[PDB]
Design an enzyme around this catalytic site. Structure first.
Site, PDB file in Angstrom:
ATOM      1  N   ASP A 190      33.393  63.327  47.807  1.00 14.01           N
ATOM      2  CA  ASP A 190      32.129  62.400  47.303  1.00 14.01           C
ATOM      3  C   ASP A 190      31.527  61.599  48.236  1.00 14.01           C
ATOM      4  OD1 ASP A 190      32.498  62.773  44.151  1.00 14.01           O
ATOM      5  OD2 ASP A 190      34.672  62.610  44.892  1.00 14.01           O
TER       6      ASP A 190
ATOM      7  N   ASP B  79      28.474  61.037  48.524  1.00 15.25           N
ATOM      8  CA  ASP B  79      26.995  60.736  48.170  1.00 15.25           C
ATOM      9  C   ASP B  79      26.182  59.663  48.934  1.00 15.25           C
ATOM     10  OD1 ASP B  79      27.160  62.439  45.987  1.00 15.25           O
ATOM     11  OD2 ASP B  79      28.464  60.821  44.857  1.00 15.25           O
TER      12      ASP B  79
ATOM     13  N   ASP C 293      23.297  60.387  42.693  1.00 11.40           N
ATOM     14  CA  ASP C 293      24.179  60.790  41.437  1.00 11.40           C
ATOM     15  C   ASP C 293      23.884  59.447  40.384  1.00 11.40           C
ATOM     16  OD1 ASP C 293      24.378  63.648  41.657  1.00 11.40           O
ATOM     17  OD2 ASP C 293      26.485  63.404  42.359  1.00 11.40           O
TER      18      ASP C 293
ATOM     19  N   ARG D 133      19.016  70.147  40.419  1.00  9.38           N
ATOM     20  CA  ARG D 133      19.352  68.571  39.791  1.00  9.38           C
ATOM     21  C   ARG D 133      18.273  67.727  40.035  1.00  9.38           C
ATOM     22  NH1 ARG D 133      25.809  68.267  40.861  1.00  9.38           N
ATOM     23  NH2 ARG D 133      26.241  70.506  40.563  1.00  9.38           N
TER      24      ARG D 133
HETATM   25 CA   LIG Z   1      29.080  62.630  43.725  1.00  7.22          CA
END
Ligand SMILES: [Ca+2]
Length: 352
Positions: free
Chosen positions: A129, A131, A170, A218
């Protein structure tokens, strides 16, 4: 004022009673927020003690550059990110001109948060993760004028053959109102979710004046709720663009799509297709596809492409104030207002 040109309405830390601090490094930001939680007596105050404006002056170009020189060594490294957890007094993290970061910003259960002028690239920890920007259970957030980049590439041997790099922005949970604007996002495979799962549906997000180049997908991967995407420049979309799922509704207005594969679609679920209202984009009909190198592909599961380029549903009246310029003007003008070092400059029809 608090107008973000989108669903979020916040001035972040730039409000009355705010305290300004300068962060020269990642640890400085962590330390500054920690100190901003204590009252005059060293005791913690729920949500933070006072509003905060943190100007980040650090530069981690050597880390960004070394990572770019060996992208496949990134996913297996430790993720790095400044957490902004349960800070609701109002906070802004603004990078100084020339600053850079090889770490992300993780917003969680906070509100009234602004991230500006941050150049974040080639982050480590794709498998864990890592990000660039994450908005989790946080409303009234404004991710504006940042440069989020990596390599739009998937190394081999990565967990789920999908972890070479993590996301740019995100969004998930109760991040009920968020505005993502004037960001220069490039070299990113998985740009941003809008709901973490089939069941994490809702929220009202606005994506405006973002410059996307060489991104795989996305933009966002939308799950339920409302998504208003206007004045964005989508170029070199290598997989898919806006993916409207779990009955979400999108208003796709005055954007410029070019060299894009599946620019507007609803795939990967096989059911509960979302809807879109198209208007003022450079593409007005299917005859414009060849003109702007717009391509479409199929999926193993039932899907809906905007290959007809017609609205597939409705969209409620946009609540906020916004004045979009023409699609041709974003194509011509956007690259100079989006990103870092544009002094947070916004594109108005005056400049068209
Ligand atoms: Ca993420």
């Amino acid at each position: 004022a608090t107008d973000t040109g989108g669903y979020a309405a916040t001035a972040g830390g730039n409000v009355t009673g705010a305290v300004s601090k300068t962060a020269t490094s990642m640890q400085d930001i962590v330390n500054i927020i920690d100190a901003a939680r204590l009252d005059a007596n060293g005791k913690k105050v729920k949500g933070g003690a006072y509003p905060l404006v943190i100007t980040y002056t650090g530069n981690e170009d050597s880390l960004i550059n070394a990572a770019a020189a060996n992208i496949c060594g990134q996913w297996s490294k430790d993720p790095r990110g400044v957490e902004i957890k349960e800070f609701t007094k109002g906070i802004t993290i603004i990078g100084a001109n020339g600053s850079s970061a090889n770490f992300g910003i993780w917003i969680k259960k906070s509100s009234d948060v602004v991230v500006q002028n941050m150049r974040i690239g080639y982050l480590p920890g794709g498998a864990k993760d890592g990000d660039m920007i994450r908005v989790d259970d946080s409303p009234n957030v404004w991710v504006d004028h940042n440069e989020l980049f990596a390599a739009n590439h998937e190394c081999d041997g990565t967990p789920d053959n999908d972890t070479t790099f993590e996301s740019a922005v995100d969004i998930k949970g109760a991040s009920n109102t968020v505005t993502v604007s004037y960001n220069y996002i490039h070299g990113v495979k998985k740009v941003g979710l809008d709901g973490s799962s089939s069941s994490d549906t809702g929220r009202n997000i606005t994506y405006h004046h973002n410059y996307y180049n060489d991104v795989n997908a996305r933009l966002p991967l939308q799950r339920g709720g409302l998504v208003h995407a206007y004045n964005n420049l989508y170029t070199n979309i290598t997989g898919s663009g806006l993916n409207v799922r779990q009955n979400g509704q999108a208003l796709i207005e005055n954007n410029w799509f070019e060299k894009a594969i599946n620019p507007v679609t609803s795939r990967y679920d096989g059911k509960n297709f979302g809807t879109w209202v198209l208007k003022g984009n450079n593409i007005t009909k299917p005859a414009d596809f060849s003109t702007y190198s717009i391509t479409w592909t199929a999926d193993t599961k039932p899907y809906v492409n905007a290959d007809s380029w017609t609205s597939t549903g409705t969209f409620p009246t946009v609540a906020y104030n916004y004045s979009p310029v023409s699609a041709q003007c974003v194509k011509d003008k956007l690259p100079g207002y989006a990103g870092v070092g544009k002094n947070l400059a916004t594109l108005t029809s005056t400049a068209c």
